[PDB]
Amino acid sequence: IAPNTLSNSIRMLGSQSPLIQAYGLVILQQPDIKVNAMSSLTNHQKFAKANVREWIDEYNPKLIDLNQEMMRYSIRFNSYYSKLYELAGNINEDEQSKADFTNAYGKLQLQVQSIQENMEQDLLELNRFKTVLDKDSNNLSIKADEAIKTLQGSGDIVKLREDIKRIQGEIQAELTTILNRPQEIIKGSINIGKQVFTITTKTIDFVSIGTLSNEIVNAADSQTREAALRIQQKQKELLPLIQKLSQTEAEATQITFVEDQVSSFTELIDRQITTLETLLTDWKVLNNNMIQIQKNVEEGTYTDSSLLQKHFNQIKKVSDEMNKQTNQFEDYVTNVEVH
């Protein structure tokens, strides 16, 4: 049993969370729109908003609950460690101690079992949502492409559209890189902004991730700061591209935003669900390993109790790291705020 059994999935589920909350609020806040060139657009947008709220109301808090469960397990385990380490060393010294260790260790394995089963249920329910969302986004992307091709007159609008999407993707990735870096103290803020463009008339709304907090923009960590500066620049690059597209065909802009916003959020949801699957795959390895220790104690394999103490310590190292990462998770979803 490696101290690294559970990799970095617990932490990453936390650090992924503020970006998902931001890209979600962008969808909620982009205004309800009708476009004659794509009459399905209104309904696709309806679905997108309802999906985001489903994630807020129903799904995201499963992840929060899981995390609390793994934290409380690690607290419990750590609280019993010294006495159970001592029992482990005495399993052959007296048949009653062997009883007492197998009883308590067994309860802790049951608790680990119980978290595994909650995880498994969570993931079944989360993949039902992922199925709907992934389909919704792809339907919308397909009808967007089709409406745009009807707008495009006599290569202009496609090129602009692509460049706007390219830059939005580069922003998304830089933001991810920021949230992936080691923060000693986990703190900051992502604000969502609204911009308006004027054509002839009429006005065009553009909601997006706007300003990042002082903690990020002036981070001591040069990779974080530099990534924050690049975001600032790319945000400004969007602005002539959007005016050009909008003045050429305004509905192409309004379609472009909705489809790009939903696709971002969808990508981030997918990645977070994948991260949970990896956590489950690894948690199963831990639990199995724990069950084998159990079986070998009962079958009498530990004729040398110090080898059981060595294995019990290995599990302590995993407990400690679980406590570390669940606390990080909690910090990310508490202290990196989104408005």
Residue numbers in the entry: 16 to 169, 171 to 216, 222 to 360
Paper text:
Nhe is a complex pore-forming toxin (PFT) consisting of three proteins, NheA (41-kDa), NheB (39-kDa), NheC (40-kDa), encoded by one operon containing three genes nheA, nheB and nheC, respectively. Separately, these proteins show no toxicity, but as a binary complex some activities (NheA + NheB: ~5%) were seen and maximal activity is obtained only when all three components are presented (100%). The NheB and NheC components are able to bind to cell membranes, whereas NheA was believed to lack this ability, despite the fact that binding of NheA to NheB/NheC is thought to be the final stage of pore formation.
There was no evidence of oligomerization as all eight molecules of NheA all appear to be monomeric using the criteria of PDBePISA. As expected from the structures of Hbl-B and ClyA, with which NheA has 20% and 18% sequence identity respectively, the structure of NheA is predominantly composed of α-helices with approximate dimensions of 95Å x 40Å x 20Å. The tail domain forms the main body of the structure and consists of five major helices designated: αA (Ser 24- Gln 44); αB (Leu 56 – Gly 104) with a distinct kink at residues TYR 95 and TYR 96; αC (Glu 110 - Leu 166) with a kink at residue Leu 141; αF (Ala 271- Glu 319); and αG (Ser 326 – Thr 355). The head domain includes two long α-helices: αD (Asp 172-Leu 195) and αE (Ser 243-Thr 269) separated by a β-hairpin consisting of two long β strands: strand 1 (Gly 204- Thr 216) and strand 2 (Thr 222- Leu 233). Unlike ClyA the two strands in this hairpin actually form part of a three-stranded β-sheet as Strand 1 forms hydrogen bonds to a third, very short β-strand from the tail domain, which is formed from 4 residues (Val 357, Glu 358, Val 359, His 360) at the C-terminal of the protein. Intriguingly, we show here that in NheA a β-hairpin of similar sequence appears to be held in position by five hydrogen bonds from a short third β-strand that forms the C-terminal of NheA (red).
